[PDB]
């Protein structure tokens with residue numbers, strides 16, 4: 001199976017193409033430091049050598065943090081906690097990218113030090129008022145771009161194999177890409193190229209920091225989560241941005257389906273064919289959102305037959321429920337049914353560390369360490 005073939009992504013020689021998608025689980029402390037057992041969570045999911053894992057979204061600066069109990073990577077205590085997580089993954093011969101974000105208008109205003117700190121590309125709330133975000137100034141944009149680069153340096157210094165730039169799901173970068181939020185009249189909004197500029201410049205600064213082979217970029221072009229996915233020129237806007245990502249030669253593009261607002265409207269393009277076409281055949285593409293063992297297999301096989309041979313699939317919910325997911329899929333073992341109780345848990349070991357391995361995997365584990 002194509003899905004089981006080794007694939008080089010960035011500097012990492014992956015041994016199969018099933019990826020742990022970035023998933024926020026709120027197991028960080030009030031200082032943004034991952035809890036001491038976060039290392040066992042990622043270690044569990046480093047089940048099979050040559051797996052790539054992508055971390056939960058990680059904050060870049062204390063001012064940009066939008067939630068409590070999510071991790072950052074600006075402070076020394078955070079960076080040391082992540083070094084230990086990354087060490088555990090590498091000890092199991094797996095690879096890990098740190099996903100970097102800022103929440104912008106989707107931050108929890110109760111968590112911000114000042115109401116001034118709720119920022120976006122423009123003063124457009126997610127819901128009809130809705131506390132109003134403040135439009136970033138030119139200098140604040142420049143500062144945010146440098147903060148992403150410095151976070152990327154911190155990540156690479158903690159040992160991460162790479163960073164993913166969180167350009168999706170209506171968070172701050174996507175708030176610049178999409179006209180349903182960005183109504184700026186300066187060079188950061190007001191046309192397809194101008195709206196794309198924020199994502200292009202964050203990407204360029206992170207590339208200068210760590211090199212294109214340690215940077216992936218996530219987008220969710222069709223997603224309607226958090227006020228996105230409604231602009232009239234949605235397709236052209238992302239065709240343009242993905243052409244620029246391809247020109248910048250990033251290690252991978254990651255495209256994900258999210259929450260679709262009306263289930264009676266069919267989705268236009270479940271496997272993102274329209275965008276994969278612009279990205280091209282040569283560089284790895286990660287697809288996420290709604291896949292299972294059979295559909296991950298089918299889409300990778302059929303894309304390969306269509307010349308798109310460099311496709312990986314990332315799983316969020318099944319990697320939560322199934323720590324040995326790639327082992328299971330390769331051995332024809334059923335993935336663990338996931339449950340909403342665990343998705344909506346916070347802080348505890350319960351609903352986090354306590355999904356079992358397959359009995360099969362346990363059978364091979366029957367030895368003294």
Ligand SMILES: Cc1cc2nc3c(=O)[nH]c(=O)nc-3n(C[C@H](O)[C@H](O)[C@H](O)COP(=O)(O)O)c2cc1C
Pocket residue numbers: 021022023024025055056057099166168169218256257258288289290291314315316317318343
């Ligand atoms: C609990 C939960 C937390 C998530 N947190 C993030 C996040 O931190 N970063 C991000 O880019 N996507 C996040 N996602 C989206 C996942 O990466 C993925 O796109 C989503 O789970 C859909 O894929 P699935 O069908 O395999 O679950 C999250 C999803 C869930 C279920």
